[PDB]
């Protein structure tokens, strides 16, 4: 057997390789980005946004974020999905973005995912898997984003129910807002300190 290659921080210049347009490098014709909605994509459009804060309460202005999620019917656009259902054909399910160098704000344009089966016949509440990379972070940090308008499904979610300190569950619930008829979910991440966001070893 082999050991997994060890992780190392992405460092402050991770944009060069993963978001070259943010580093002002035009080298690729097709660039991976933060827009998961194609013209024919099914589902309700939403915007996910927030900032990531360090232990002094300051935003990280060099953080890189990725999300992975199911389509509107809770099917993943992956050959490893075993539901035997047809996935939305105009949906990659993944996106990547970087916080703005001046403000630290990040965002994604995506759709609200449908509920995905959990283990042993259970049903998970709608959620987005998110990972954070940045200078100072030795191993990408995994977390999940749940939605405050899915109270009923959240209360029965197997992963949230597996966090024994109940007060910490709330850090994984994003808040719905409506900005000009656009649905926005605000999810701020706090790496350390009070109200520290739950991080998972997955």
């Amino acid at each position: 057997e082999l050991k997994e290659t060890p992780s190392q921080t992405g460092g402050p210049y991770v944009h060069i390789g993963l978001l070259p347009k943010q580093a002002n490098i035009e080298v690729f014709e097709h660039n991976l980005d933060n827009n998961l909605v194609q013209d024919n994509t099914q589902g309700q459009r939403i915007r996910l946004e927030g900032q990531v804060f360090d232990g002094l309460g300051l935003p990280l202005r060099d953080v890189l974020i990725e999300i992975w999620q199911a389509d509107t019917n809770g099917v993943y656009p992956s050959q490893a999905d075993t539901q035997g259902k047809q996935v939305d054909p105009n949906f990659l399910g993944w996106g990547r973005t970087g916080a703005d160098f001046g403000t630290g704000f990040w965002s994604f344009n995506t759709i609200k995912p449908g509920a995905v089966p959990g283990r042993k016949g259970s049903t998970q509440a709608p959620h987005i898997s998110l990972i954070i990379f940045a200078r100072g972070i030795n191993i990408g940090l995994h977390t999940r984003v749940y939605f405050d308008d899915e109270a009923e499904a959240n209360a029965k979610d197997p992963v949230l129910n597996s966090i024994e300190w109940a007060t910490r569950r709330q850090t994984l619930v994003a808040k719905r807002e409506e900005r000009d008829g656009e649905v926005v979910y605000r999810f701020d991440i706090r790496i350390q300190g009070e109200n520290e966001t739950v991080f998972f070893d997955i």
């Binding site: 050991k3 997994e4 290659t5 992975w68 992956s78 972070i137 070893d201």
Partner: protein
């Protein structure tokens, strides 16, 4: 074959989040322990990228940003295999790389080092592994980068890399170094890794039989990701 979950990440084989010798980790590491969860479809699936979207020079850092001539520096090819921990090849995984130029200067708005910029070098590339898990790219060997951790900190020459493969649980970013670089023994970032054998796992080896005469040297570097177990009895994933 019915696949079950990925094997658990061995935390002793990776750096801890809090590592005081690497100063910026002090305020950017959680104080709480990570919460381990049992895997679901969310953790064992991942996106698929198609080679169709990739340009012909995406894995050629020598030519993909070249405008008036060739970049200055040591011509090198890097290749190897991406496998999972059970030794199976990882097919069609997305590998993205980024690095500094031959001066140890990064093409990034926030890099102010005096090492010179090279107008013909960008420093980023990408490729998909083939069906044997093999990948290959060509580049200029980067110079070591001085930075402020302690004031006179110098990192060894390195190439950063990221992989997106079959399962979200496999998501990984790291960097590799070049055999023999004396700075490897002093780097505080490499030293966050606890064990000597894992630090050695990040060193690319000189592959002399693959050098191209009067052209380029070659380095061999293999990458190992987490692997899934097969299930033969109950399948609780779903």
């Amino acid at each position: 074959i019915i696949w079950g979950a990925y094997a658990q990440r061995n935390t002793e084989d990776h750096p801890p989040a809090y590592a005081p010798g690497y100063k910026t980790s002090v305020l950017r590491s959680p104080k709480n322990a990570l919460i381990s969860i049992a895997e679901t479809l969310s953790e064992v699936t991942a996106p698929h990228f198609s080679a169709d979207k990739f340009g012909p020079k995406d894995n050629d850092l020598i030519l993909n940003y070249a405008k008036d001539g060739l970049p200055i520096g040591e011509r090198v090819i890097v290749h190897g295999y991406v496998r999972d921990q059970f030794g199976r090849p990882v097919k069609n995984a997305l590998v993205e790389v980024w690095q500094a130029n031959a001066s140890g200067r990064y093409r990034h708005p926030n890099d102010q080092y005096i090492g010179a910029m090279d107008p013909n070098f960008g420093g980023c590339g990408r490729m998909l592994t083939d069906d044997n898990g093999y990948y290959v790219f060509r580049t200029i060997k980067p110079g070591p980068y001085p930075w402020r951790n302690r004031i006179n900190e110098w990192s060894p020459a390195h190439i950063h890399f990221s992989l997106i493969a079959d399962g979200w649980a496999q998501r990984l970013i790291s960097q590799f170094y070049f055999e023999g670089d004396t700075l490897i023994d002093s780097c505080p970032i490499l030293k966050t890794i606890p064990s000597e054998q894992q630090r050695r796992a990040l060193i690319a080896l000189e592959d002399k039989s693959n050098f191209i005469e009067a052209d380029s040297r070659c380095y061999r570097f293999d990458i190992t990701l987490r692997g899934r177990r097969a299930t033969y009895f109950e399948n609780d994933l779903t």
